[PDB]
Amino acid sequence: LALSLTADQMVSALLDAEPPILYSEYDPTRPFSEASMMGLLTNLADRELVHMINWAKRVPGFVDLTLHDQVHLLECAWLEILMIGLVWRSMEHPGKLLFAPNLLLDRNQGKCVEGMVEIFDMLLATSSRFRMMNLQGEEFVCLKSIILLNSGVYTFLSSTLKSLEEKDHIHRVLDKITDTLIHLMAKAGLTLQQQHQRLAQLLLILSHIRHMSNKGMEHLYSMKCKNVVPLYDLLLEMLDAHRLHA
Amino acid sequence: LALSLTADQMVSALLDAEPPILYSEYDPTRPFSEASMMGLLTNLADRELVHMINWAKRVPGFVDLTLHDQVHLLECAWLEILMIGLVWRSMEHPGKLLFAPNLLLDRNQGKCVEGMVEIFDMLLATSSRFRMMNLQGEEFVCLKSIILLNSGVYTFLSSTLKSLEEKDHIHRVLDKITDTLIHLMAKAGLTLQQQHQRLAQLLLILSHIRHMSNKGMEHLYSMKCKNVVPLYDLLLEMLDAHRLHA
Ligand SMILES: Oc1ccc2c(c1)CC[C@H](c1ccccc1)[C@@H]2c1ccc(OCCN2CCCC2)cc1
Numbered sequence: 422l423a424l425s426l427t428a429d430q431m432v433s434a435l436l437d438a439e440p441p442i443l444y445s446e447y448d449p450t451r452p453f454s455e456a457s458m459m460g461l462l463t464n465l466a467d468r469e470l471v472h473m474i475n476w477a478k479r480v481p482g483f484v485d486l487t488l489h490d491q492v493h494l495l496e497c498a499w500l501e502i503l504m505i506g507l508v509w510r511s512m513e514h515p516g517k518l519l520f521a522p523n524l525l526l527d528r529n530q531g532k533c534v535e536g537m538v539e540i541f542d543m544l545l546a547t548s549s550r551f552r553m554m555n556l557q558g559e560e561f562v563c564l565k566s567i568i569l570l571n572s573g574v575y576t577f578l579s580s581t582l583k584s585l586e587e588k589d590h591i592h593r594v595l596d597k598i599t600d601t602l603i604h605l606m607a608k609a610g611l612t613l614q615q616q617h618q619r620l621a622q623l624l625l626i627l628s629h630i631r632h633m634s635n636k637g638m639e640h641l642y643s644m645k646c647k648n649v650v651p652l653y654d655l656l657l658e659m660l661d662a663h664r665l666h667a
Numbered sequence: 668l669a670l671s672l673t674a675d676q677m678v679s680a681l682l683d684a685e686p687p688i689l690y691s692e693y694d695p696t697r698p699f700s701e702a703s704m705m706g707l708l709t710n711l712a713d714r715e716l717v718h719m720i721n722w723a724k725r726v727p728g729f730v731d732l733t734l735h736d737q738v739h740l741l742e743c744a745w746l747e748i749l750m751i752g753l754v755w756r757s758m759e760h761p762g763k764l765l766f767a768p769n770l771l772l773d774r775n776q777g778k779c780v781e782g783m784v785e786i787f788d789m790l791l792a793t794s795s796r797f798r799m800m801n802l803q804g805e806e807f808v809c810l811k812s813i814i815l816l817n818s819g820v821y822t823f824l825s826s827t828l829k830s831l832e833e834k835d836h837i838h839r840v841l842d843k844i845t846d847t848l849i850h851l852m853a854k855a856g857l858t859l860q861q862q863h864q865r866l867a868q869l870l871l872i873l874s875h876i877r878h879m880s881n882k883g884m885e886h887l888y889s890m891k892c893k894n895v896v897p898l899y900d901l902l903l904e905m906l907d908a909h910r911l912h913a
Pocket residue numbers: 462463465466467469470503504506507520537540637638640641652
């Protein structure tokens with residue numbers, strides 16, 4: 422039961438749920454001139470999405486939702502989630518984006534079309550902002566979970582009784598995550614004022630993350646495959662697990 | 668001095684700053700068939716922007732910024748600000764959007780191209796959400812001010828000393844607005860837990876507002892004039908006031 426966790430248990434569950442850090446797939450003994458940067462990043466992102474499913478299923482309360490609802494939330498959120506992870510791992514790399522341990526790019530490497538130089542700079546500024554806030558790992562996992570639960574919660578196109586229950590559940594969990602962030606902050610010695618202030622600062626950054634995702638989606642839709650499985654459909658298949666591998 | 672206001676003085680200043688509610692301009696004795704819905708809404712939005720300048724100049728701390736910074740924040744925020752106002756005035760109109768007192772549209776009226784039916788539904792859901800939260804007028808003016816100050820704050824493309832001071836000032840004001848929201852909430856009788864929870868719920872809605880603005884921008888850019896003054900430029904002229912009308 423997600424609504425029964427204590428703050429410590431919420432944090433411990435998020436921390437234990439973290440996905441791995443993957444590597445970009447390229448021949449390191451090959452000229453950099455030769456790689457397609459978008460190809461690299463597309464390959465990486467696509468591998469990260471499988472692990473994002475496994476992560477999401479471990480976010481307390483997520484699998485209490487309907488399959489359809491779980492797909493919708495991921496369909497709305499996945500790009501924000503890739504981005505907040507990128508920005509987290511880039512904190513200790515001022516001026517650079519740590520896409521993977523073997524793929525650290527500066528803004529000059531974002532310029533090869535099109536494109537990214539816009540998104541690049543925005544991602545770097547957000548990384549800068551987290552650096553300046555001394556964002557902690559325990560706060561980061563709360564925020565990534567909040568994105569998962571929140572990004573899609575006002576675009577469910579139903580007001581069925583089931584859909585009211587789904588939303589109410591999501592709002593309860595999100596409330597629990599707010600309580601957890603506040604707890605982390607009191608435990609770190611912050612005054613109540615600084616607690617409310619820092620909570621607000623962190624949530625306000627999620628709106629820049631939304632922006633960045635929308636801008637990035639604009640680029641990705643402007644380059645979309647034709648006779649392909651819709652994302653909803655890829656998401657649904659990865660989420661719609663059997664229990665034969667128990 | 669904005670940083671010296673009490674919570675009561677912040678609220679009183681925001682409340683006193685509210686823009687007027689304008690009317691759509693059309694011949695009411697003329698078939699509805701004949702109006703261009705986008706034409707109506709474009710005309711209205713453009714009139715509202717002048718008043719948004721006057722509003723913004725009254726948001727404590729805003730005119731302490733540089734002219735360039737004030738233009739940037741408005742350039743990033745203006746569509747979110749029109750939208751949050753729309754959603755506020757639509758609360759008491761379930762299923763309808765109160766663009767103006769003489770222009771209340773349901774989702775079926777959003778369908779005449781293209782387009783809006785997407786944006787329409789999103790705006791209605793946000794209105795629904797505020798209704799369900801019993802959003803208060805005093806909270807609404809805090810949130811609209813937060814959008815003004817926050818939407819553009821991580822896309823200033825400078826790290827000059829002046830630009831560090833600008834950002835620090837913005838963050839201080841935003842902090843003051845957080846304190847004010849918390850104050851409103853304690854004064855309304857909410858427990859501390861409910862205070863943190865409600866603060867987080869309200870700020871999380873700002874990310875849906877960002878989304879909606881981005882989607883709406885996508886539509887507006889897909890219909891842009893050629894030999895026209897850039898928005899930055901229109902904004903700069905309206906903001907770059909003389910003091911000859913004292
Ligand atoms: O950790 C990460 C790995 C890769 C990335 C990011 C984080 C941040 C956004 C990047 C981006 C750059 C330019 C334009 C848009 C986004 C890029 C990235 C590249 C490609 C992506 O998408 C490819 C399409 N793919 C098919 C279904 C799932 C997505 C996603 C993200």
